[PDB]
Amino acid sequence: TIKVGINGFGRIGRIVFRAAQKRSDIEIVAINDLLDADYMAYMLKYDSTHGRFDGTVEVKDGHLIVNGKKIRVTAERDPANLKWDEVGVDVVAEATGLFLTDETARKHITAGAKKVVMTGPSKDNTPMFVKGANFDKYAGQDIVSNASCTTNCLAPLAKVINDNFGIIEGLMTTVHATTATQKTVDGPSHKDWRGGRGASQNIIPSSTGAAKAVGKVLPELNGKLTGMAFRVPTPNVSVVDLTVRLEKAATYEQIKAAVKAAAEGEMKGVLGYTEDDVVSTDFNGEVCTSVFDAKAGIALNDNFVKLVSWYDNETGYSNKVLDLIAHISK
Amino acid sequence: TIKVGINGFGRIGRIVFRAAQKRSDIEIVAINDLLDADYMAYMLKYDSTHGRFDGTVEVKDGHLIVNGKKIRVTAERDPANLKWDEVGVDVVAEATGLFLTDETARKHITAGAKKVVMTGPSKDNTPMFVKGANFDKYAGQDIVSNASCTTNCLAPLAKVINDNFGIIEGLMTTVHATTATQKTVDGPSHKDWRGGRGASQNIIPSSTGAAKAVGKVLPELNGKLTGMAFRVPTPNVSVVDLTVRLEKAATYEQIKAAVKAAAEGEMKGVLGYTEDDVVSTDFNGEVCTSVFDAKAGIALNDNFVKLVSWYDNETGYSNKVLDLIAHISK
Amino acid sequence: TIKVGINGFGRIGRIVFRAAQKRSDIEIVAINDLLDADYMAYMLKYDSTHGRFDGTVEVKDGHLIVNGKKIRVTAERDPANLKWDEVGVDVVAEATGLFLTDETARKHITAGAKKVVMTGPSKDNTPMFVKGANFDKYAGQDIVSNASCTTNCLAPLAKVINDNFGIIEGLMTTVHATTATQKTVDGPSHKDWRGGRGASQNIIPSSTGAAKAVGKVLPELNGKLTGMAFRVPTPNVSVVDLTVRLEKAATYEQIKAAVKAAAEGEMKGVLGYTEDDVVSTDFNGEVCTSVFDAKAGIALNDNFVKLVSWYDNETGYSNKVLDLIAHISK
């Protein structure tokens, strides 16, 4: 099995931990964050969004014991001190949000790990990979990025649409759940003023590079997409709303049939498909990073259409972080 | 002054009542609904969304007395019994949602009123009017409709964009506040399954004819727009997100300048314009039916752009119901 | 196995259905409500609060098929037409809220069922039973009531406290999740004005007979308790806050030890006990009708103390409805 260390025990670090438990190719052996072991046990055991941990959690002498396995718990602010080799870590899941460049994330390799996967879009030229879009493009690099939750939703859908019908241009909106970077009441957020306003009171317009970033994992779509977001008062699960102009005329039935084929074929497990009367909570826990909502979309004509796709911005992304860890460890 | 009777004391009936108080051309003299006078006084006095009534409210012997004026209170299920002439009603504000055809709403005229304004889109060919779009088209009809809250947001913005640059085609999404037709928890809604799901838990996809209905008040845009909606867990204020292809190339600065000109000129008071870091609560109480958010929109190129416009789906619409009452009473 | 029919497919009807699936002594064979079979399948399959149904749901020719079993689906407004004997129903779970008297609920027996369990407090002298309090008092009656969700929380806790230390007098508050009887925005509720105000905007004071009703299942506490409620913007899970004067002086450690003993002994499975840092979502899905929160309570002195106990007002109650069905079928 691949021995994984988690750096940062935020939302993504903890949901990656939970998703790792169902896997037989990957073992979390260590967690680093500025939290005591008994508190980490608490955050793992109880989740407001995903329920109680399915398994056993205990602290025996500053060591986490999860389903019988000792997890090493450290609290290093500098990843060079992490001594990953002492616990045998093959790949670090870098989930603090603070080491999104090669210079910073390579400190993990200095500390004894073989490879690193950033759980967010890289801030330099570190390559990005989205499952369903460009995993096959991986060329042995030792530091990679899994891009963002919204890019993971948009890129697989956009590849299906573009491969079958040709995207001339698209604009996307994501109606996005509240996240940890928001405020409970109007508070300070000096780099993003709207984002300081009270999260449960407001529809909050927000920026995103996810649509532009699609052009990085799918360079044929480079320059052809952009978008924005609205944050709304839900705790989890988001939806993209993709408005595209198509080169080849395609009825809505043809679009539906092409997405369903992908979801049952090449993109099984990353792209999903539904025709039911779903709402956002129906995707709480969803492992597909992109579930096409057939009934919700609408076409003006055969070359101009709005497509709707759901994603659990915690769970889907976290599972594909693991998929990327497995893929680069092959 | 124009003597107005309100039929139905729901959200729209009560916010129309409140907005009428600041006006000197219009007096509410009667309210019909299946509510006792003391309960009507209660619903008027306290509003979770808009605060305490600014004025005095008392019940003296089954008569509402609001800022010193007797309001006649009745509870007729059939509008033919309403005897509007006994209290001198010129125009009925028909706000029950149940009499959206000519056959049904004309019962108000049978009962002694001169004209009727439906506070929702008509279900037959009753003409619709949206301020900023086609009030000038009013040709003396005695039963009219003020269309819907979302059409009132979309149509003025779409006229500016189309008059300056030519809309080839557009698709719109409205991120819409929760409304009275939704459920607090998962409950029955047999004509709209998604709409029964718990309103505060969910992003809820929803249908709307508002974009198509733009082609009725602005027939030059007929067939050129459609859209859908998402209901989200906020109590009031909605936003349209309009993705349009433009005939004439127009930079985002040119679009901004053209909307701002309209908001300071022909469409002053219906179309607003802002460049601040607004969120939805900043428009709670907004009287403009459409406030353009300059910072939130985004263009892919000079012919393909996404435009953002805010509306208080209670307050703006309610004020324009009054504007339509005044206009047809001229 | 006991063959059960469900009358009414609201929140309680559906959660009773889900809880029945894990049981081997009880089979739901029929559901009556004014809903088509395909819509019932939809409400069963997707739950905003409890996630996707764990099993299979299909409609084959107006018949529900759930985990392989045909469920008879009818839509009778009058229970005398229900023909329960045609599908072999031993006990009806009466969960519409409309037949809470002997005269009305006996229509189920007229229709071929042996016994009836009302899923709410009876409105006449129909006996009430709360597990942990007075199931042993059941004397063969053919129509019974499982009281209310809040009585099911309060009565087991109050019996432990009173048996060990003697309750002189108590006042309780329940901070209660939003329910189906509330409104999404300020709307009409003529029998309960506060309860019409928008559920997600407000703390809403509310009445309850649950504390008084404790004196019916535990007649030694008759006249010794009363209380009220606040409804708050959460979709599920409530908490009682019980302030009692004690006859025998008892430290908080003694109270803790006595509740823990009950939860591990006589009241195992109905009364739970925790010392963790729980919040309300940690009890979403809880089967115990009363989980004592050791850390949250506080004593002023050894004879005056405030006790805190959690309950999933959907899940716990629904499971004990089944327990009562099993108990009276013995």
Next chain:
Amino acid sequence: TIKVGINGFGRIGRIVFRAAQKRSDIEIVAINDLLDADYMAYMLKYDSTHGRFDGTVEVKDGHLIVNGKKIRVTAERDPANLKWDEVGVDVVAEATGLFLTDETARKHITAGAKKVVMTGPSKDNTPMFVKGANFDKYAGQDIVSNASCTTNCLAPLAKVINDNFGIIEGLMTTVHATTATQKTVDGPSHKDWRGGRGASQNIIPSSTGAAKAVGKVLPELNGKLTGMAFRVPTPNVSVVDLTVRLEKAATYEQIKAAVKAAAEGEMKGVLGYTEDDVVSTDFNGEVCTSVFDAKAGIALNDNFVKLVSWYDNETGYSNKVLDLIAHISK
């Protein structure tokens, strides 16, 4: 007029600023916080909870100009550098939460201010004052504290009840709105684990010294009260639920009449009284620190009763901070 400087522009700093504008005895002349002037202008202009600022706000060259008055804007981390005398500050409103001891808050006097009012409970023996309870006890001190929002609700009510009937012992619960110290989703809060859980998802048990602190401003009640809190998903307005044993037997009508007398007499303006069907939003903007809810309370007998009182935990407290500034400047 009294020249006031505000240190810290959080929720309390900004609502104190807004409340100061209606006053003619007090002028805010300076604000210190780690925010640029244009951002301070933004936070003042738009409030999710209290609406748009009623007045004019502009930035002219790093100076705030509010309703025509220059406000000095600084960003000192150490209050000794604040040079309050350069702008003529008589009293500092210390609202950062970081200088709640005499040693730390006296740095404001070192910097040229005459007196200091802490906008929270002091952490040393700095005296506390609650209007309606012990303002008359002020003995000329130059550093004081206005205690906490919840003590400001509880102490005036408890004085009325104790003066008329004698409180033997009381236990209180406050159902409290979400605050800035909570998290939007499950996040880190190592000193208070429950308080890290997602604020909009949860009822969250919480500690409070407000009931004990009543015994400091009203020493006759020392040792006679304690309590706890639940945080719930509302953005503003809280309620105390006070369970008391009374020495002198008193019907609920007698309790009502005694609170109403206080609210119309000695405690006019701090203690309010209502018999309407209010919910929490009806007190958004409330200036009374304690509004007795006559209909919501309940008595078990003439010596054991539960009393309900509302407070806007932002607005009421902020106004009494100003009242305390005025009182000590007399």
